[PDB]
Amino acid sequence: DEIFRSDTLYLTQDLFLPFYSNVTGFHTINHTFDNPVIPFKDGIYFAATE
Amino acid sequence: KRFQPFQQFGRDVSDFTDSVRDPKTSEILDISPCSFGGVSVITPGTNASSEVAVLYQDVNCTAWRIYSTGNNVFQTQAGCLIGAEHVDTSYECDIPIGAGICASYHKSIVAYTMSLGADSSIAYSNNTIAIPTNFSISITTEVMPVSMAKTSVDCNMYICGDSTECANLLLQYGSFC
Amino acid sequence: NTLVKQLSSNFGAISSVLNDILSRLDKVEAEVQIDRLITGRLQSLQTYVTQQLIRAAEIRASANLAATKMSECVLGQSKRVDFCGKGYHLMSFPQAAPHGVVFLHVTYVPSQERNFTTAPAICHEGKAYFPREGVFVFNGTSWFITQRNF
Amino acid sequence: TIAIPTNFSISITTEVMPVSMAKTSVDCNMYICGDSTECANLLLQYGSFCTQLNRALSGIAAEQDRNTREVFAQVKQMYKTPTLKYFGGFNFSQILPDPLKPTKRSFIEDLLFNKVTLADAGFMKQYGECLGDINARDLICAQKFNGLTVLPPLLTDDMIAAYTAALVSGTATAGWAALQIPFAMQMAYRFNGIGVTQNVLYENQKQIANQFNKAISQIQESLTTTSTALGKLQDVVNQNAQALNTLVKQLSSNFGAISSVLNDILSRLDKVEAEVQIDRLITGRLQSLQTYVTQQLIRAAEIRASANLAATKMSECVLGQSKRVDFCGKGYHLMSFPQAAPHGVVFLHVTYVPSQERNFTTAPAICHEGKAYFPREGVFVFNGTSWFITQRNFFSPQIITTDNTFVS
Ligand SMILES: *[C@@H]1O[C@H](CO)[C@@H](O)[C@H](O)[C@H]1NC(C)=O
Ligand SMILES: *[C@@H]1O[C@H](CO)[C@@H](O)[C@H](O)[C@H]1NC(C)=O
Ligand SMILES: *[C@@H]1O[C@H](CO)[C@@H](O)[C@H](O)[C@H]1NC(C)=O
């Protein structure tokens, strides 16, 4: 949220990425170029290491 | 407190808004309640007198946070006391103020330190012993409760009176009777 | 009397008087307010019952101790200290009282203590003659053997 | 065959018992409706369940003061410390106050107080102090701002220490309104009460004193190190704090309303619409207060049961010798000493423990010349040379005589 909080523990229900869940990897190099259409499925987490 | 740009208000665990960013100057401010502190009232009974004494637990009067200052403001262990005269003598604690302080009505309200009991010294002697030579017969009383009054409740009487519609609503509610 | 007085209170309803609601409101609209009142009044009854149970437990603890006193003090002599009176206990008598019992304890109280020189044992002729449950006291003329009391 | 002991030991054991709990008060208009005037009027046009709750709480507080009075105020006359601390080889230091140390409490009492951690050293918190320390999330400030208060006990800790010192001084001299007897002499009387003969005490006095002082030192060494011995008088403390902080936290909860924050509702809703939500919140918060009060009453009953048993122990064990089994210590009971502790009392019981049992052949009666000479409260044992008459405890053989036995 946009509320400020300090030194406390706060519980919330929301769409999150569960801990120790599977993530798919796509690697782009000269040999292989990957750009498939990926489903959205109620939101996504996207990480780029480059 | 340090506020991020997208924040405007701050809340505590009880969800009471305790911080606010000033719109014009962007300065963080803390919001605190105004009412705070404990109060107690000592009286000897309306029939005896109309005067009372007032004790403030969270004030040290050697001041500002008191309703009035009638006379004799003096600091005790229990807190700041207003309306009582202090007496050095020890007594038997008619009214317990607290922290070893008691009050009584002597004609004014007086406050004193609590008296534990009579003071005596017993000698220790290796070669001496005391034995009684007389005796007395004392009769003492002890009062102890045994039973209390037995009661019953008609819940349809207490709830819904003689009304038939409320009784049906009570029915289409639940049987906690 | 507190239960009686609590009927005056509204519990979020427009009125505490049921007859007014039924007089000037139709069934569906009256249902809401009557349900609010029902909830509040049931809650009051439950609070009363809980407090009665706690008081009853206290009274039970008091009654058991009184029964123990009757068995121990009235029908016997008790050697427990301060159970059946402050002094040494001799006898006790019960009297009935409204919702309770009053015990009269009769006790022995020593008085007029006098100081003597005391010996634990007597060398006599280089032997040890121990008192056998009494105190050796020196009256001024010769040594004597006495009880702790009287 | 029958076995009889030939030796004995002096053991000192401790028992910890709670006496009172913290006294509290609630400002219901503070906890419910804050400083808002409209919510106060709605509270008014609801009901007065605040008078009942506070009547119950005040009763509890008075009961706590009464509990302490009944445990510690048995002694009528106060008895000055003898200044000698030594009686017949027994060291009563570390149980009595030391003039050199400024504090009026004893060494063991100091250890006990140090062990138990207490939430509040003092009962005053000033408004300016709460304001200045806003950065720290002080729990007491949060309790106070929401209408919850803790009240000080009537009897200060130094007073309880004085009562305990008077009781110990009375035990040391005059025994259990004064008898005036030498320590060693009285100790001889306790042995008789047990059943052992006086000469046993007088002959072996130095060994018994060494053992006693020694047990005291072990108690001290056991308390110096950290243990869960005083756990009960800690559980009691944590329970109270936990209940108050739980009441503080419960204000965050909605009770079917749109928000838990009253100021938001009043800011963005008109009177009639705000009334519904405020009534829901009022109902919920009153319910929380009632639950807290009920739990406090149940805890108070438990503490009352504990205080009465402690008072009975003080009367029976400290001011007398008890023949009840295991009431004032595991072994045969001789004496007991009280020490004050935070919200409770610690009893030190001194007991006689038999040891080194030896087996002899036993006879119930002696035919002698076709007659029956019964022991008269002793056992007939065969040592190997001739028959002897002895006690149940601490084997001491005596020649059989007509006086020792009774004919039948
Ligand atoms: C609002 O007006 C005041 C006075 O002109 C000014 O100091 C302040 O900066 C203004 N607000 C902002 C955040 O610019
Ligand atoms: C009251 O204030 C005075 C002066 O600051 C201080 O010396 C005294 O200790 C205070 N009393 C208490 C018990 O806080
Ligand atoms: C009593 O104990 C103290 C401290 O342990 C010791 O100094 C003293 O010698 C002992 N007895 C006496 C009075 O000698």
Residue numbers in the entry:
A (entry chain C): 44 to 93
B (entry chain A): 543 to 604, 618 to 661, 672 to 742
C (entry chain A): 942 to 1091
D (entry chain C): 693 to 868, 874 to 1105
Give the article text:
The trimeric spike (S) glycoprotein decorates the surface of coronaviruses and mediates entry into host cells.
To elucidate LA binding by SARS-CoV that emerged 2002, we determined the S cryo-EM structure. As before, we did not supplement LA during expression or subsequent sample purification and preparation steps. We analyze SARS-CoV S by cryogenic electron microscopy (cryo-EM) showing that LA-bound SARS-CoV S adopts a hitherto elusive locked structure sharing characteristics with LA-bound locked SARS-CoV-2 S, incompatible with ACE2 receptor binding. Locked SARS-CoV S is stabilized by LA occupying a bipartite binding site composed of two adjacent RBDs in the trimer. LA binding to S also induces a profound conformational change in the loop comprising residue R620, which then engages in a cation-π interaction with Y819. Another stabilization of the locked S trimer (and closed S trimer) is achieved by R1021 residues in each subunit, which form the center of a symmetric H-bond cluster, cation-π interactions with F1024, and salt bridges to E1013.
